C-alpha cells in the first residue's frame, strides 16, 4: 500500500495538483476565475486585487520583472514547505539522519517543483497566485533579460512531460522518487537511501504498469525526465546566481538562498 500512502500524502500536502489545476485551466473556476495577465496593463490590474499594498516595505513601484520575481519566489517558498511535509510522510524518510534529510531536500525540491509546475502549465501560459492568475508564455518572453529567460525552459520541459499524460497518482510517486535519490552530493547513509530509492522506484514501476498499460515503456521515459530535471535545475541555479549578484532590487528569500548556496 506504499503507492496509496504516498498519493495520500501528496493530496494532503500540496495546495495545487493536476486535478485542481485542470479544473481552472478548462474554464470551470466559477467563483474567482483566474485573472489573465498578458501585458503590463493586465499585470497591474491583476496585482490590484491579488497583492497587498504595503506603505513602505512594498513591491508596488518596483519593476514589473521584480514584482513577478517576488510572486514566483514566494510560491516556491511555500512549495518547499509543502515538499518538506510530504517528505516526512514518505516511509523511512523521518528515520534518516537530519543532515541527510537536509541534503535530499536541498537537491530534490526544485526538481520536484518544476515537475509539479508542469501541472499548472499549458502551451499558452501558467497559473500563478494559487490559481487566481494566468500569465501568458508570450508575456514572460517579452520581459527584459535575465527575467525573460527563466520560464521558457520550464515551459519546454512541461510540454513534453504533460504529453506523457500522467495523473496525480503517478506524479506523487515520481516526486517521492526525486526526493529519495541516493545520488545527491554529500549523502551519508548512501546504501539505505539507495534502498529507499529502489523501493519507491519499484512501487512507481508497478504503478505505471497498472495505471498506464498502453505505454509499456513509460518508466524509462520517466527515468530520462529525472535526468532532464536535474539538468534543468543546474541551469536554473546559474540564472538565480546571476540575479542574486546583479539584480539589486531582487532580494532572494533566505530559505531559497540557503537551498541554492553550495548547490
Amino acid at each position: 500500500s506504499l503507492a496509496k500512502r504516498i498519493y495520500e500524502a501528496y493530496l494532503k500536502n500540496f495546495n495545487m495538483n493536476k486535478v485542481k489545476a485542470r479544473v481552472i485551466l478548462s474554464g470551470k473556476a466559477s467563483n474567482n476565475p483566474p485573472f489573465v495577465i498578458h501585458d503590463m496593463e493586465t499585470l497591474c490590474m491583476a496585482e490590484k486585487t491579488l497583492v497587498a499594498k504595503l506603505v513602505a516595505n512594498g513591491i508596488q513601484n518596483k519593476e514589473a520583472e521584480v514584482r513577478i520575481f517576488h510572486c514566483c519566489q514566494c510560491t516556491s517558498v511555500e512549495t518547499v514547505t509543502e515538499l518538506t511535509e510530504f517528505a516526512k510522510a514518505i516511509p523511512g524518510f523521518a528515520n534518516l539522519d537530519l543532515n541527510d534529510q537536509v541534503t535530499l531536500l536541498k537537491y530534490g525540491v526544485y526538481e520536484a517543483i518544476f515537475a509539479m509546475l508542469s501541472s499548472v502549465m499549458n502551451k499558452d501560459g501558467m497559473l500563478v497566485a494559487y490559481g487566481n492568475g494566468f500569465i501568458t508564455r508570450e508575456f514572460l518572453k517579452s520581459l527584459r533579460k535575465p527575467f525573460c529567460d527563466i520560464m521558457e525552459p520550464k515551459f519546454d520541459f512541461a510540454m513534453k512531460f504533460n504529453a506523457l499524460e500522467l495523473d496525480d497518482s503517478d506524479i506523487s510517486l515520481f516526486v517521492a522518487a526525486i526526493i529519495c535519490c541516493g545520488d545527491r552530493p554529500g549523502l551519508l547513509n548512501v546504501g539505505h537511501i539507495e534502498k529507499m530509492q529502489e523501493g519507491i522506484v519499484h512501487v512507481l514501476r508497478l504503478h505505471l504498469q497498472s495505471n498506464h498499460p498502453d505505454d509499456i515503456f513509460l518508466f524509462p521515459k520517466l527515468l530520462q525526465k529525472m535526468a532532464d530535471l536535474r539538468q534543468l535545475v543546474t541551469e536554473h541555479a546559474q540564472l538565480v546566481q546571476i540575479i542574486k549578484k546583479t539584480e539589486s532590487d531582487a532580494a532572494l528569500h533566505p530559505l531559497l538562498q540557503e537551498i541554492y548556496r553550495d548547490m
Binding site: 518547499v80 518538506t84 511535509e85 516526512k88 537530519l98 537536509v102 531536500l105 533566505p254 530559505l255 540557503e258
Partner: peptide, 11 residues
Amino acid sequence: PSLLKKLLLAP
C-alpha cells in the same frame, strides 16, 4: 540552525 533544518525539525 539552518532554515531547512527548522522545517524538518517541525513537530
